[PDB]
Every structure is written in structure tokens, then in C-alpha cells.
Ligand binder design. Structure first.
Ligand SMILES: Nc1ncnc2c1ncn2[C@@H]1O[C@H](COP(=O)(O)OP(=O)(O)OP(=O)(O)O)[C@@H](O)[C@H]1O
Ligand SMILES: [Mg+2]
Length: 541
């Protein structure tokens, strides 16, 4: 029946639903509109999720899992996983297949199983509110997630007992939330998302034509090293160094103390968005031969700002790239939307307002907008939300090079995503044993006048006259905008494939120039294609 929207966060998760025309963020049993993304396995056999898991973490560092979003869909040898292994107090292991897993109480578990526990709590929160079963969900992911990260998030959804109707990017969700307000049509917005796990920036166009409001991503990127956990780490390091200076003890080899110090640091960081100073007070933090030792360290806001200044400044460069990739100036951004708990830091707000020259909108809730927008997309799919469309179309034609240096289109410009199209090709020479699939992007008919996106070989073709072998070429663009190209020899069974990342932006200024350029050269391109075609389309070596 109803489709719920779930923000599966590194730090916090949130669930929302469409209640007729207006979205509703749903409270859990303690009364909370967000739930810590924390899962704990206790000595007496319980599985805790949320605030109960958080409260017993500082005593159970081994069997309390958090920040599992940093692992999901990743390989054990991935750079980020290895960086994560040390800092995490729980055991991160390699699965038999090379995926990054965790081990708790001797049980080896895949991240989607762990995240499913958070998603089940979200589902139940919703089922409790509706008095009915819920099984359909829109789940969000960072815009930087790849296919494996998305698929694994879909898995966690299923393991939680959810039909995953849709995965959408978090900044897009926030834009749908904002785009519920009136007067927001025909605007460009910047979505500045500083969460617990990463920084993301997206430039999104909200247009309104013939009653339909459309949402289209013009640029995205970010940095997984600029999240609130990185802010926390700078303050932890300062608290470690200050305790060394005050009392000559290095807390880093004492896991229980470091766990208490991590939580205290985060709470102090949070408090310093409201106050000018705060006190970190941790009695019985450690002991040496002379008895127990106690921490009491005052931290001013200016000191915090000094500790994280470089982190905040490093968020500016991805903004500049995002605007370049959309072909826009700051003067084209009609509104700035802050998403994420870490944007509540006053220094972050001021730096963003300085860059854009305007104050971020204040009627967007940075903890809830992602979950709200996911619910909006849910209502779009059920038909409860009318006249709202997420627009994802190919900017330019996509194809391969064929004989004569021709670009042969498989997917035409302005095709809606996701999409899949196949065409069968053959060989250009008798007894040709291999073909080269050269993937091309653009509107020109000569392959060399278009952009090369990648290439690969298919060999093992059995000897046969030119034109006889059947090479099926498939272009599949998934919802993440990732292009999958395969080539399969139907008679030998051999197949080869590649994956082509989505572009970081859609620069309509440059796209329309390329379109006009092709139109200016249409006749020349037509004549070119014709007297080459006087020779089923064929592939050279
Ligand atoms: N008032 C505040 N001032 C500064 N930081 C805060 C404040 N409130 C929360 N935070 C920080 O916000 C971060 C979590 O924000 P949020 O809940 O948006 O993350 P998330 O959506 O779970 O993460 P991600 O988007 O990476 O998956 C944490 O690092 C937390 O310490
Ligand atoms: Mg988030």
C-alpha cells in the first residue's frame, strides 16, 4: 500500500511517509524522529538497535557496531576499509570472497545484515504508526555510491523485509523536500550536505512547465574525508594531547577510555554550536600505579574552530568543481539548502553563506529533509504525488564505432534513464577473431568527432566469412547513471563487458553548443555516413 521513505545514515536514520499531501516524519518508541545507526550484540544474547545500542556502547566496544555505512558494498582491500579497520573498535575481517565483513561473538556478518537491523526498526516505526504492515520503501544513498554500494543497500532493504521500490540520491531527496514549498519552481539550488560520514554537494534544477515540476541533477561531488566523524577526530586528538600535557598519560592504548573520549568529544562539538565554551568531564577515565585519573578539560568554540578550520575550507573546492561541471556561476544559484547535522556548526553556515553570497534557506530541516524527500518519491510512485518528476535523461547520444569510422548510436540523446538497448553487429574481415568495442559519446557521425568513453576487446570468434558472426552489443544505463556495455558472441558464448561511470555534471551551456554544432554539420555528416555505408553493421579488429 504505502511506500515509506528511509534515510539510512552513517550516524542517524530517519523514516517518513506521505500523509495525503503532506509528508510526516515518524517518531520511534522513545519519541525520537531520528534513530542512531547503531547495532549492539550483548553478553546476554540481545540485539539492540538505536539509542539502546548507543547507551551501552561505551562498555561494549567490541560488539557495538556503528558507521557500517562506511563498509557496505566495499571490498576488504578497499583503501577506505583498511583506513577504517584500525579506528573501529570492532573486528573487521575479509569474507571468503574478499568483501569487507564484521565479526561479532565469533559470528561473521555481512554489512547489509547489520544495516538491515536499522531498516527493520524504521519499518516497524512505520508499521506502528499505520497499524498495518509496510513492505515497500524508497531508500536513499550518498550521491557518490557506486553500483556495489547501491546493490548492497538494496540487499539490506530486502533482509529487512522491504520491497525496495527505489534507491535515490540523498541530495535529490532533500531537493524534493524543499520543492514541496510554493514558489520553488524554475530555480537552481545548491544542496550542501555535511553528514557524519561525508560531504556531498549537488546542484539541482527545479523547473516547472505545464504544471509539472521536474528535478534534475546538474552536478555532484564531495569528499568522504570531510564528515562530522573527521570533525570529531580533531577534537579527540586535541583531548588526548591535552591529557598528556596535563597528566603525562597517553589514552590511545586504552580502548574503554578512547570510547568514552569519542562520545564526550562529539557531545562537546555539538554543544559548541550553541555555546562559546564547554567542559569535557570524564571521571575515572584511566588509572596508573598511583590510583585513578580524571579528565576535566575546557574547550572554547574558537579552539574548536581552529581545530577544524581546514576541514571546513576543504569543502569549498568541491563546490567550485560542481559549479564548473554544471556550467554555472554562483549568480545562477537561487537557493542554498543545508543538509546534515554538521551544517549546524556556525562556522560552516558562515563559510557557505560567504561563498554563495546569500543565506541558506531556513525552512529546510537538515536532519529530516532526506527522509522527507524519499517519502515524496514514494508518493510519486503510488500516484499520491502528482505533477512531480525526477528527470534523468541522457544528455548526448551513446554508441560504438563501426566500419568506416562511423558513430553508430545505441542510445539516443534525451532517453530516459534507466534504459537498455541492444544491437547485433558482425565482423568486417573474413576469419576475424576479435572485435574492439569503442564506446563513444556525442552527436556527430564521424567517430573521431565524438568523445571516447572507454573501450574493450572481444576475441575467441570462430573463423567465418565477414558478416556471419553475431556480436550482440548491449548498452544498459542503470538508475545510478552508470553505463554497462557488453558484447557477446552468440555462437561461441564468449562475453566481455565494462562499466562507465556517470559524468560528474551536466553542463547545459556546453551540451547545447554541441547540439547546435552537430546541427550546423548535419548535411556534411549525412553525406559522410552515406558513401561509407555503401560497403548488419560491421566492427573492425
Ligand atoms: N548541532 C550540531 N553542531 C555540530 N554538529 C552536529 C550537530 N548536531 C549533529 N552534529 C553532527 O552531525 C553528524 C551527523 O549528521 P547527520 O545525522 O546528517 O548524518 P548522517 O545523515 O547519518 O550521515 P551521512 O550523510 O554521512 O550518511 C555527526 O557527526 C554529529 O556529531
Ligand atoms: Mg545524511
Amino acid at each position: 500500500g504505502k511506500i515509506i521513505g528511509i534515510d539510512l545514515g552513517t550516524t542517524n536514520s530517519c523514516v517518513a511517509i506521505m500523509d495525503g499531501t503532506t509528508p510526516r516524519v515518524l517518531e520511534n518508541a522513545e519519541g525520537d524522529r531520528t534513530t542512531p545507526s547503531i547495532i549492539a550484540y550483548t553478553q546476554d544474547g540481545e540485539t539492540l538497535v538505536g539509542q539502546p545500542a548507543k547507551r551501552q556502547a561505551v562498555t561494549n566496544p567490541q560488539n557495538t557496531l556503528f558507521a557500517i555505512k562506511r563498509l557496505i558494498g566495499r571490498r576488504f582491500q578497499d583503501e577506505e576499509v583498511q583506513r577504517d579497520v584500525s579506528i573501529m573498535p570492532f573486528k573487521i575481517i575479509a569474507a571468503d570472497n574478499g568483501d569487507a565483513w564484521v565479526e561479532v561473538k565469533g559470528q561473521k556478518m555481512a554489512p547489509p545484515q547489520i544495516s538491515a537491523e536499522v531498516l527493520k526498526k524504521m519499518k516497524k516505526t512505520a508499521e506502528d504508526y499505520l497499524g498495518e504492515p509496510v513492505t515497500e520503501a524508497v531508500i536513499t544513498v550518498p550521491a557518490y555510491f557506486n553500483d556495489a554500494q547501491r546493490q548492497a543497500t538494496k540487499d539490506a532493504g530486502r533482509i529487512a523485509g522491504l520491497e525496495v521500490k527505489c534507491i535515490i540520491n540523498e541530495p535529490t531527496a532533500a531537493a524534493l523536500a524543499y520543492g514541496l514549498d510554493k514558489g520553488t519552481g524554475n530555480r537552481t539550488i545548491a544542496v550542501y550536505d555535511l553528514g557524519g560520514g561525508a560531504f556531498d554537494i549537488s546542484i539541482i534544477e527545479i523547473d516547472e512547465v505545464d504544471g509539472e515540476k521536474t528535478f534534475e541533477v546538474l552536478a555532484t561531488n564531495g569528499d568522504t574525508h570531510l564528515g562530522g566523524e573527521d570533525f570529531d577526530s580533531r577534537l579527540i586528538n586535541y583531548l588526548v594531547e591535552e591529557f598528556k600535557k596535563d597528566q603525562g598519560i597517553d589514552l590511545r592504548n586504552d580502548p574503554l577510555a578512547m570510547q568514552r573520549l569519542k562520545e564526550a568529544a562529539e557531545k562537546a562539538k555539538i554543544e559548541l554550536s550553541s555555546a562559546q565554551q564547554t567542559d569535557v568531564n570524564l571521571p575515572y577515565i584511566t588509572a596508573d600505579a598511583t590510583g585513578p585519573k580524571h579528565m576535566n578539560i575546557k574547550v572554547t568554540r574558537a579552539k574548536l574552530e581552529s581545530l577544524v578550520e581546514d576541514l571546513v575550507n576543504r569543502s569549498i573546492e568541491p563546490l567550485k568543481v560542481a559549479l564548473q561541471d554544471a556550467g554555472l556561476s554562483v549568480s545562477d544559484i537561487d537557493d542554498v539548502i543545508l543538509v546534515g547535522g554538521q551544517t549546524r556548526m556556525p562556522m560552516v553556515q558562515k563559510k557557505v553563506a560567504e561563498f554563495f553570497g546569500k543565506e541558506p534557506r531556513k525552512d529546510v530541516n537538515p536532519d529530516e529533509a532526506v527522509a522527507i524527500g524519499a517519502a515524496v518519491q514514494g508518493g510519486v510512485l503510488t500516484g499520491d504525488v502528482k505533477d512531480v518528476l525526477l528527470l534523468d535523461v541522457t544528455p548526448l547520444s551513446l554508441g560504438i564505432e563501426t566500419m568506416g569510422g562511423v558513430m553508430t548510436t545505441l542510445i539516443a540523446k534525451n532517453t530516459t534513464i534507466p534504459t537498455k538497448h541492444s544491437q547485433v553487429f558482425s565482423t568486417a574481415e573474413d576469419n576475424q577473431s576479435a572485435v574492439t568495442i569503442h564506446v563513444l559519446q556525442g552527436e556527430r557521425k564521424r567517430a573521431a568527432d565524438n568523445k571516447s568513453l572507454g573501450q574493450f576487446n572481444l576475441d575467441g570468434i570462430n573463423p567465418a566469412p565477414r558478416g556471419m558472426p553475431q556480436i550482440e552489443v548491449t548498452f544498459d544505463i542503470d538508475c545510478d547513471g552508470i553505463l554497462h556495455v557488453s558484447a557477446k558472441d552468440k555462437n561461441s558464448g564468449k562475453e566481455q563487458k565494462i562499466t562507465i561511470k556517470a559524468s560528474s555534471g551536466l553542463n547545459e551551456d556546453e551540451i547545447q553548443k554541441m547540439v547546435r554544432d552537430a546541427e550546423a554539420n548535419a548535411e556534411a555528416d549525412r553525406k559522410f555516413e552515406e558513401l561509407v555505408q555503401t560497403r548488419r553493421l560491421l566492427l573492425t579488429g
